[PDB]
Amino acid sequence: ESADLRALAKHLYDSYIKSFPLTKAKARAILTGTTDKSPFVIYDMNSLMMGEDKIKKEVAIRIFQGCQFRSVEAVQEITEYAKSIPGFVNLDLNDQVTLLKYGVHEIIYTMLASLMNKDGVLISEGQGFMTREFLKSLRKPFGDFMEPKFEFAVKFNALELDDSDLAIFIAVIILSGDRPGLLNVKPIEDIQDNLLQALELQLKLNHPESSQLFAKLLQKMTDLRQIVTEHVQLLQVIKKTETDMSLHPLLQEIYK
Numbered sequence: 615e616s617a618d619l620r621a622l623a624k625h626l627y628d629s630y631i632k633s634f635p636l637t638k639a640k641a642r643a644i645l646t647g648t649t650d651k652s653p654f655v656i657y658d659m660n661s662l663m664m665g666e667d668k669i670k671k672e673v674a675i676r677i678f679q680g681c682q683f684r685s686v687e688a689v690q691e692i693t694e695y696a697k698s699i700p701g702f703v704n705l706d707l708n709d710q711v712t713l714l715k716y717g718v719h720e721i722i723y724t725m726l727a728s729l730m731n732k733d734g735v736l737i738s739e740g741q742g743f744m745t746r747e748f749l750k751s752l753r754k755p756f757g758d759f760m761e762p763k764f765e766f767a768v769k770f771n772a773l774e775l776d777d778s779d780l781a782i783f784i785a786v787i788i789l790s791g792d793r794p795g796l797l798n799v800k801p802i803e804d805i806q807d808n809l810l811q812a813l814e815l816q817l818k819l820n821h822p823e824s825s826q827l828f829a830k831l832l833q834k835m836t837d838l839r840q841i842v843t844e845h846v847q848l849l850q851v852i853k854k855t856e857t858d859m860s861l862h863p864l865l866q867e868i869y870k
C-alpha cells in the first residue's frame with residue numbers, strides 16, 4: 615500500500631521540522647529578499663568586525679573555529695532526527711554509532727546547500743551572510759576550505775528540492791547498509807528499502823514534471839562522498855601547519 619508510504623513520509627517530514635531550527639524554506643525566504651529577515655553581509659575585514667558587533671586570533675582561523683562549533687551543533691540535530699527513524703533505535707547500539715559516524719557529514723553538506731547560492735552562505739541561523747569571495751580570499755590553507763561546498767550547492771540546488779523531500783533523503787543516507795564495520799547489515803538494508811520506497815513516491819507526487827529525479831538525486835550521493843574526502847585531507851593538513859589549533863573531541867571521534 616502506498617498509503618503506508620505517504621504516512622511514513624509525513625512522520626519523517628514532521629521530525630525534520632522538529633529537529634532543525636533553520637529549514638530550507640526559511641533560508642530561501644531570506645536569500646531571495648523582505649525587511650525583518652534582511653541579513654547583514656560580510657565581504658571584507660571591516661564588515662567582518664562590523665558583523666561581530668551587529669550579529670553576535672586571526673580572521674581565517676577565528677572563522678574556521680565557528681565552522682567547527684556549528685558542525686558540532688548540526689551533529690546533535692542529526693543525531694536526534696536519526697532516533698525518530700522507525701527501526702533505527704532498535705538496531706545494535708554499535709551499528710547506530712557506525713551509521714551516525716559516517717553518515718553525519720554527508721548530511722551536513724546536503725543541508726548546507728539550502729543555505730547557499732552562488733554568491734554566498736547564511737550564517738548564525740540566517741542572521742548573517744558571508745560572501746563566497748571573502749572565504750575564497752582567506753589565507754592558505756583556509757581559502758580553499760569552502761570552495762568544494764559552493765560547487766556542490768549550485769549543482770544540487772538545481773534539483774529544486776524542498777524540505778519534505780530532503781527529510782526522506784537524509785534518512786536514506788543514514789540508513790546505508792554499506793558502512794565500514796556494520797555488524798548486522800540486513801536489518802539496516804530492510805529499513806532503507808522502505809525509505810527508498812518513500813522517497814520514490816514522494817518525489818513522483820511532488821515533482822510530477824521532473825523526469826527521473828529519483829535517479830538524479832541518488833547519484834548525488836557520489837558527489838557527497840567526494841566532498842567528504844577532500845575535506846578529510848585538507849583537515850589533516852591544517853593539523854600539521856596549525857599545531858596550536860583546537861578541534862572538538864566529537865569531531866575528532868568521527869574522523870577516525
Ligand SMILES: CC/C=C\C/C=C\C/C=C\C/C=C\C=C\[C@H](O)CCCC(=O)O
Pocket residue numbers: 677678680681682684685722726735736737738744849865
Ligand atoms: C558563527 C559562524 C562563523 C563562521 C561560520 C562561517 C561559515 C560556516 C558555513 C558553513 C559551515 C557549516 C558547517 C561546517 C562546515 C565545514 O565544512 C565544517 C568544518 C569542520 C569539520 O567538519 O571538520
